[PDB]
Design a protein around this ligand. Structure first.
Ligand SMILES: OC[C@H]1O[C@@H](O[C@H]2[C@H](O)[C@@H](O)[C@H](O[C@H]3[C@H](O)[C@@H](O)[C@H](O[C@H]4[C@H](O)[C@@H](O)[C@@H](O)O[C@@H]4CO)O[C@@H]3CO)O[C@@H]2CO)[C@H](O)[C@@H](O)[C@@H]1O
Length: 311
């Protein structure tokens, strides 16, 4: 109740997203089931935390009180506790709630009821667990509507838990686009601001099946002095926003898809990491073992070069 967010940002440090798992409709549908040993592997390689994308919306009733289903809550307990056991900090969020993005009015009560339940569930867990409000707000959930939503969410959470650091993202899909429009209530002072970074989007997502028209970006490379300047400019913008609004920064997701040439990916990833570190930002790579992966779960081997870029 006198906790520091910048310190909590230090505790986050370097992390990795365990994606295409709990944020799919059912765990495993997208290729990944979170095994307990992943936490050993991740801690052993040097990471300080894991970010866990969770699709609470498909595992909660659609009518008041929007109760989260017992079996699912039990599964999330098990994942969080498995990470904590290895000494890893943990970031959990609400992920892929598409109905909310498309109709924020109709789904507002359900979304806040999810947080009421989650805060209640974990209010007494370690201070190394972080609550990330909503992954990539977008579409009809405009930057203005997001500022209202996030303040309601902080109110719901803080009425229950005044200990855990809350992580707040940006609208327009959570990148830099809407950063200037973000308003974090002056009254809330234990929050970290999160930005996802995938620019040049065409490079990072080239050939992504889930992005319309991405097959036209296939073959794009990255690495020129030109490229580097463009990125620093964008990070300085974040940094200056950060200094002005006095909020720590967490780059909760960043990565380049497997269809991008390997060397460009390694150059883009190592550069992004060094620049984030110079600005003393925490970060989480997207993602552990799937389409943007750095670890092969079958052979149990890392992509050395990519891991090194991360460290
Ligand atoms: O649908 C049945 C089909 O599913 C296949 O799994 C696919 C899945 O269909 C597809 O939606 C999913 O796409 C993921 C993508 O892999 C993942 O990297 C991306 O992560 C986002 C993140 O969620 C965002 O918040 C932000 O951080 O950006 C990143 C990167 O863009 O999320 C998308 C969500 O659509 O990929 C799955 C395969 O890995 C099954 O494989 C197939 O068997 C089934 O028939």
């Amino acid at each position: 109740m006198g906790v520091d967010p910048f310190e909590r940002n230090k505790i986050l440090g370097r992390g990795i997203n365990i994606g295409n798992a709990l944020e799919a409709p059912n765990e495993g549908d997208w290729g990944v089931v979170i095994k307990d040993e992943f936490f050993d592997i991740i801690k052993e390689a040097g990471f300080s935390h894991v970010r866990i994308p969770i699709r609470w919306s498909t595992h909660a009733y659609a009518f008041p009180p929007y109760k989260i289903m017992d079996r699912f809550f039990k599964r999330v307990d098990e994942v969080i506790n498995g990470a904590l056991k290895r000494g890893l900090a943990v970031v959990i969020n609400i992920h892929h709630y598409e109905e909310l993005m498309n109709d924020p009015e109709e789904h507002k009560e359900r979304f806040l009821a999810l947080w009421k339940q989650i805060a209640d569930r974990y209010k007494d867990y370690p201070e190394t667990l972080f609550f990330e409000i909503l992954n990539e707000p977008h579409g009809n959930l405009t930057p203005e509507k997001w500022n209202e939503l996030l303040e309601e969410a902080l109110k719901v959470i803080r009425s229950i838990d005044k200990k855990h650091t809350i992580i707040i993202g940006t609208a327009e899909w959570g990148g830099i686009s809407a950063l200037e429009k973000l308003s974090v209530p002056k009254w809330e002072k234990n929050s970290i601001v999160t930005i996802h970074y995938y620019n040049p989007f065409e490079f990072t997502h080239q050939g992504a099946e889930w992005v319309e028209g991405s097959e036209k970006w296939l073959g794009r490379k990255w690495g020129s002095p030109d490229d580097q300047k463009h990125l620093i400019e964008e990070f300085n913008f974040i940094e200056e926003w950060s200094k002005k609004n006095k909020r720590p920064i967490y780059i909760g997701a960043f990565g380049a898809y497997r269809k991008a040439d390997l060397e460009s990916r390694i150059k883009w990833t190592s550069f992004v990491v060094r620049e984030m570190e110079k600005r003393r930002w925490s970060w989480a790579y997207w993602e552990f073992c799937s389409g943007f992966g750095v670890y092969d779960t079958l052979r149990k081997t890392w992509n050395k070069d990519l891991l090194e870029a991360l460290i």
